[PDB]
Please model this.
Amino acid sequence: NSVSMIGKIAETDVSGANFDGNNKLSFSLFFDEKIDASKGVPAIQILNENNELVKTIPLKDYNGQKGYINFEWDGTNEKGEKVPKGNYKIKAEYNLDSHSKQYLQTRIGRGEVESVIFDKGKPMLRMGEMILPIDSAIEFYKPDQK
Amino acid sequence: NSVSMIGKIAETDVSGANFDGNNKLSFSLFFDEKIDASKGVPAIQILNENNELVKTIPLKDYNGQKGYINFEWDGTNEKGEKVPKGNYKIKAEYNLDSHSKQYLQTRIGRGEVESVIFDKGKPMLRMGEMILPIDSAIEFYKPDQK
Amino acid sequence: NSVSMIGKIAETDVSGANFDGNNKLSFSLFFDEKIDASKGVPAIQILNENNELVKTIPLKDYNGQKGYINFEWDGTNEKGEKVPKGNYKIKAEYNLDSHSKQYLQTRIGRGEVESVIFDKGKPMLRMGEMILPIDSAIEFYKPDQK
Amino acid sequence: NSVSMIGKIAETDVSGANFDGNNKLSFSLFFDEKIDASKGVPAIQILNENNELVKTIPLKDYNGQKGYINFEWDGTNEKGEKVPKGNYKIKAEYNLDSHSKQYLQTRIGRGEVESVIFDKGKPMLRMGEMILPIDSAIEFYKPDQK
Model:
């Protein structure tokens, strides 16, 4: 019944993507600030169920972009070998802060709520390409904040 | 009691208008962008219960207008013969995109929510001339988006 | 003239290894605590002159070991293709702390000073397989500390 | 100066309505007798400047009404295409006489004079919605008679 989520940033309990074992997988990451390639080495980390780094996707070529950006992952590790099927965490690091020596952070399952959809009649949040149930949301706040 | 819908664009499960068999029928369509008559041929499509084109109403004369616009349909097909009574889908195409070669789209039962009305005490959305129950809404988003 | 460095841990200004473009390269890393493979994912990171991750060497198979351990790097990246010649930083992460969520850290060019050598007559520190001049040392402290 | 026209039926030299080429047009017809839909097929005829039948508007739905009745014409012909701008004659046929096999007749620009208006100070006849100058009247007689 509540549509006030629209325009807010949402944090969800979804931090992974299912890889079926064979088909390439699509995902969206939300960048709160404009990506600056001169600040550190910005990159996506794909991790398996035991937090082992399976693939790094460099973000330097996406300099100047912000908000939702769409990506693909073939399901290969750095060697090029197809990984076991399962749930894979996708996070990112970008814009290394000169003073604090820390990167800004984003991940799959967070970002601006762009629309609310009633699926006869359960409510759902459109967050880029992800469509998630309301119950999955664990925090809301306005853009440029927290 | 959620009034957060006000100012959002709503999509509803109402896509048709009832024609009684005889009387002319009034309806409202919501144009998200200003109608440009130089871009393609803009027009309304009236379709029967089996998606058969019954009438086309040209929109070229409404150049420069936007938002809710009101129209009438006499209940006649292209020949001028009164159609069977029943439920008729009303959609429209306007502003042929030069690059993508696609028209922008609107239809009956969507548009800006202008007010919320409590009908002692069931809530209702004023969407131009249409006043619809809350349960009919299947999606919300901000203007200029999706 | 000072032999008091022997038995201390030394930190040096050497953090890289030169790769000639073709030949495999040997290096030593000093593990202050016993490597625990159940605590996170322990691994070596090989980074190029611009801090880009070129190779990850997993340390899980070295569970239970401590102190100096020797390794080889063929000069290939994760795909198996020989990298440009140049200076490559070699660091490692091991033993993820359960409470603080941080890994212990080591790198090339630090560890226990095992002997002091007078090279007629400049003094030199034997630090595992590395033999470095005294002037390269930037910090000393006792084992189990800092 | 003469108000004796009030209550009489007037015939005027106005037999047409101007259509601008685009906007729907309003007009009033005077029915001397109550419209009986069972007696023939009662209808309005809209004729161009050369007496060509352009539109027929059926009067069956106005059964039981009498006197002035207001109507609209969109400016379309029977096919639904907008007609050239110009002057259009509007007449009607109703109540087919069983004996004589003839319809009763009315047209635009005739009917009961309901009031006389002095427009500082030229006199004017209110004839339903039409307000016409005195000089336009070409005949007067009492109701029920000719």
Summary: Residues 1-13+110-146 of chain D form one domain. Chain D has two domains: 1-13+110-146, 14-109.
